[PDB]
From a paper:
The accessory chains interact with the tail region of the HC domain. For example, the ICs interact with the ROBL, TCTEX, and LC8 LCs, an assembly referred to as the IC-LC tower. As a point of reference, we looked for density in the volumes that correspond to the IC-LC tower of accessory chains, a feature that is only observable on one face of Phi dynein.
Cytoplasmic dynein-1 is a conserved, minus-end-directed microtubule motor critical for cell division and long-range intracellular transport in eukaryotic cells. LIS1 plays essential roles in the activation of dynein, including relieving autoinhibition and helping assemble the fully active DDA transport complexes.
Author numbering:
A (entry chain g), B (entry chain h): 110 to 140
C (entry chain k), D (entry chain v): 13 to 113
E (entry chain i), F (entry chain d): 1 to 89
G (entry chain e): 1161 to 1353
Amino acid sequence: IKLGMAKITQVDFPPREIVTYTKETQTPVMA
Amino acid sequence: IKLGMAKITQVDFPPREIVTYTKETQTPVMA
Amino acid sequence: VVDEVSNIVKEAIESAIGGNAYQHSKVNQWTTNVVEQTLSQLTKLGKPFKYIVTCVIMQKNGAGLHTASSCFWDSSTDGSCTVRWENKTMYCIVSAFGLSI
Amino acid sequence: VVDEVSNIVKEAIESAIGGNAYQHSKVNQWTTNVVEQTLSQLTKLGKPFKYIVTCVIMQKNGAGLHTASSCFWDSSTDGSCTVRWENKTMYCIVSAFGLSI
Amino acid sequence: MCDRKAVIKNADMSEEMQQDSVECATQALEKYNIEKDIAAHIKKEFDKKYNPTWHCIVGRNFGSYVTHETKHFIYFYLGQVAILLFKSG
Amino acid sequence: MCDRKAVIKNADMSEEMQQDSVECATQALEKYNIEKDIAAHIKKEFDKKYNPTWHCIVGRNFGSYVTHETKHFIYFYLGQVAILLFKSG
Amino acid sequence: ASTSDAVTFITYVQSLKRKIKQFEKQVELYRNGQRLLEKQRFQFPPSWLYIDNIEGEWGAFNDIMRRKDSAIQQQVANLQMKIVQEDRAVESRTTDLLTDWEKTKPVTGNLRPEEALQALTIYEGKFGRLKDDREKCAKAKEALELTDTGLLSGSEERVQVALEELQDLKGVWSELSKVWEQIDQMKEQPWVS
């Protein structure tokens, strides 16, 4: 049994894209 | 090759459950 | 027969996990059934290779995963086949490592 | 040895990742490094078996991955070992196979 | 009732999410003049359109810093009452 | 100084979370003369404490409908602003 | 997780909704009463909410019950399907086990009464478990929209036959133990005495 270096399967899952921002918000005010 | 008595060991990570124990209430506007 | 192995793996994944409503007591059962079907496909093929199939069943949750299998043999008598399957909210990935005696 | 192989896999996991988290551009790299470390540990063991090591790095974001490996190998001479490594956010689910030839 | 003119001057979301919020606000304002029910309908539309979990808050003189995922804060103002549908999930 | 306390109208959450939310909201309202700036400060404190990011409701008119997960969900009135701060995830 | 657990939870959710219809009627009436009190200025003391505060607590309880009912209805399909499959399989296996035990119970010589009683109890337990699994599958299918033959089908008849054979084996175990007590006394009495 002869074993040697080779190339393995490169399977990966890309991550999700999301941005978390606590930006100041307020509804418009009408009298 | 007569395969011997072999099996599969399944040890999965626990998933996430939804607990919809909503605390609904009466939320009035200022009046 | 890498293409036949991939086709049998995809068929077993669809028959076991597929994309239906999984359960806590049924996700592991589906993964075990997929593994057993992969073993049955390897045994009924009759190819003289001690295949090792790593059945991967996961739920889609936005987390990374990279199941890479590395063997120690010769490329003339051993090989691997890649089949990719996806579900609505789960996954069923099968990779077999056919190694000759 | 099954116990020696599991201990070597655990030690290689501790030396490679251990309890730290992974990244989108490094999860597959960490999996490949862990698989290579397992293969090197199996090669330095001297056990006459064609080493087959699979390493998967999974994040702790609710993705329930069912890790298993079904192989047509004898129980008293060969085997396939699968376990899930515990960490803070990197549940490494690595399955290793050892088949004497 | 209320003719829900979706004045989304700053709808920090995608076009599909903004359209879903505008349609939910229009249907809710046609059905009834209830601010809480309109916000609930906008939240239901946001949960349908941008997956779990989503919510919408509607008020007249209210202050809430929209802190959620990007392209998930549907902000269409039915005049001045901005129904901030920030999907925190 | 307005007292942003809570009455027993609906209370299914963690006491530490409720106390932190009430103190952060009242302190931000006292510190920032703008309601939007106060909401921003409350969101900054909440994202610093209980991880980032989530949005809460503090205003005159408040009401919605969502699957409120426990330990971080309540529906009350914190003084002059309705206390409806529920974190889903 | 179990089929029987899912069926029991679905039945509990149905009964909870039946009680919660009147409970939410009382909660809405109490919210109206607290609103009338506020119309008279009679808000509840600040330590609690108003009567509308009690209405809000009832609404929170109703929302929690609705979420629990949604989870139960989600799990009910899987529960009923697992119940019906386990019921058919358990009915067949219980019929087979009861027949085998009643035919070939533990009839060895020494201490054989215990072995025969164990075999009869195993056969009867298999038959009864098959019948109960079929009944649970039928109930879970009725209460969760599943397809299960929970009636007195061939599996039910096999389970009944297995239960009868297991009752016969248990009676054999009892009679054999009664005989073996005297037999062991006669054997263990002193040879000189």
